[model samples]
Target: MELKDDDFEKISELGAGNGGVVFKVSHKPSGLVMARKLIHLEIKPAIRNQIIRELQVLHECNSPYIVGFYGAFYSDGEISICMEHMDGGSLDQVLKKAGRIPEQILGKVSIAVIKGLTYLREKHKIMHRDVKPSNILVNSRGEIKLCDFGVSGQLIDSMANSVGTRSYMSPERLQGTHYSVQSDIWSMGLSLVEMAVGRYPIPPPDAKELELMFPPMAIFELLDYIVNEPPPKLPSGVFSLEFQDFVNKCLIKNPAERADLKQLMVHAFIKRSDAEEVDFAGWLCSTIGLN
Candidate 1:
């Protein structure tokens, strides 16, 4: 596919995040819609590969439930990569729309997401360190796709630093010692719990409290109790038995004990997804004795 520089017509900014600004740009000739992600030009070369590493992971990972890189563009001042544009904004947006989503579909979404990770694990040996609703995009089909490989890691020591959204981060991440694919598994667990609850796993009452949300050291401490020790107790009225089990397995602090994407794919909740909706919000509404 021949792509020219001018093919992309500037449209509007899609998002702004840690990386920089993401713009919804279109290929004028092909009518191709894409996300153009730009990084600061002043960034040093040694660190430029950091962003490049994410692009590499995106290039290696191809799935209907995974976002793609259409092209990479460069100029003297900015680094841009074209990506698939999902009509639906994100899981965050989805939750805002429905107030609460059907637990059944949330499972569908998680299944699709985990399968995409399974592909990366088996085919690409990839691990997405950042697994949160904000990073996962939903298209008009209600299909869940994984995006943002910027903080992805591997089972092995691909990178030294720990990275992920705190609310979705596992306990091991806080301790900040050795981290691996299991860490990503923890994130998956947290996200599934989020889908079920309609609230973040560790929702803080205020901003200052949020700062100390999950200390880097706390994750390391979580590892010891994750396996031999059972997961943290769920508040009363937390999950359906099936979904609780679902979250428990994925969040194993023991990296070695954690469920890989392959194993998680066969879990009971994922396998028996069609029977009923988990009723996360309703249960919570009931649990706290709310009307």
Candidate 2:
């Protein structure tokens, strides 16, 4: 449906950006709930390009974990993205509300995300580039849905490394080198670290002083780990050693060394509690009241 102020009833402001603000809106005709992200009249080409590409990708992806695009429109330099409204808010919000989610539950949420990423990787060699809890979404039913495809990239004949969020960037990306799927893995790892510790692994005093606060030359060293060395240590009680070490492998800075989507999906860390259950099914059934 076309976006029109008269068509949508704005409920609340979700967020604001250089271009515009996102709001919770309801459609006038169908009464459908949606997120209406509005760009100002002076929208720049870069922002327009990003919106175009994002809409394109959303059109291509059809998964339970991906946010569905409803419509997009441009009016007097103002752009609007009308899409699904997530009731459960972002994963970060969930973590903040619940405070330290159980490993099994986190894994469950992560598995849905992996399932979506796997589709993107195999179909078009797409890389999420930015993987953060804030970008991960959950609905009322507790299903995880990955959002914000703005930073996503696709592999081309002349793929160039694109820098993303500093805390989540891969070593090769920080080095201004060429990369692929591996970059996304690095982002996933950083996101995990944030989840485990309730903060960044290296919270620099300033953006420029990151390496000093983190391990020395952390960007490059991170690449070495994701490529050639062991993974970084997480806080105690943050996660199982197996899960921590596995994410470390994915966060490898060298794109060449990062796990492919298939490999990542099969990794033990992403395993869901629903898969390969033991006598624990009795407990599971009892919990869900299926018993």
Candidate 3:
């Protein structure tokens, strides 16, 4: 179904990214709230095409772990996409606002992300390319879904160059190699660290003072650290050995040695509670005082 401008009433702006701006909207007749993303016609053809493909992927790929896509249409030279509205916003925002997520909760979130990525790879024959905390979202019902597919596809030649946050990028991806699912696993690993620790695995030496100390060299220095230094690791003593090993496997510098999606899904840490269910949404809400 094609979406019309008058089909929904604007609630508020949800976010803005390089390609488009997302608005929280309520369907006029159904009274259902959903997110509306608008991509301006001014974008370069390459980016425009990628955004179009993103819609097609979302339309074709069906999984409860992935965000729901309702419809899309073009109007006034802008392409608009209608999608499910997530209540808890992004995991990045949640981590930043609430500090480190508890281990139990983080474990469940990690598994959800893994399942989502696995579906993208094994079922849809594509790679998410970009996997970060901000790309993951949650609802009040304990549902975790992965979103943002502008850089997702089956073409490794194009995606190997990488197209997302540098901090979460894999070593192979940053070096511009023929990377694929393994690279995405690395990103997912980093995203997991950010969620578990409430900060980047390897944070800027001093975010407040880095620029002031070396304003001209800050960016280069950080990139060098990420490329040359040992991979980031979770802190010791605080978390379980199972969790630590899981993180280590994910951050392996060499993609060849990295754990694949199937292995990771069954990793001891993620599988600890696989047989038993936990209400992650309730735990998060209670922790954040949403309950």
Top TM-score model:
3
lDDT score for residue 101 of model 1: 54
Best by lDDT: 3
lDDT of 2 at 71: 74
Model 2 regions lying over 4 Å from their true place: 17-20, 40-57, 150-166, 203-231, 236-238, 272-291
lDDT of candidate 1 over 49-167, digit per residue (tens): 55555555556567877887776645445667778887676676666555555557677777877887777667777677678877888665445688765433321233342233344
TM-score of each: 0.74, 0.73, 0.85
- In the range 89-112, model 2's lDDT, one tens digit per residue, is 666765665545555665665676
RMSD of each: 7.5, 7.4, 4.8
Return the TM-score for candidate 1, rounded to 2 decimals.
0.74
lDDT of each: 0.64, 0.62, 0.76
> What is the overall TM-score of model 2 with all chains considered together?
0.73
The runs of at least 3 residues in candidate 3 whose Cα sits more than 4 Å from the true structure, single-residue gaps closed, are 41-54, 150-166, 204-217, 289-291
lDDT of 3 at 68: 90
Error of 2 at 165 (Å): 8.5
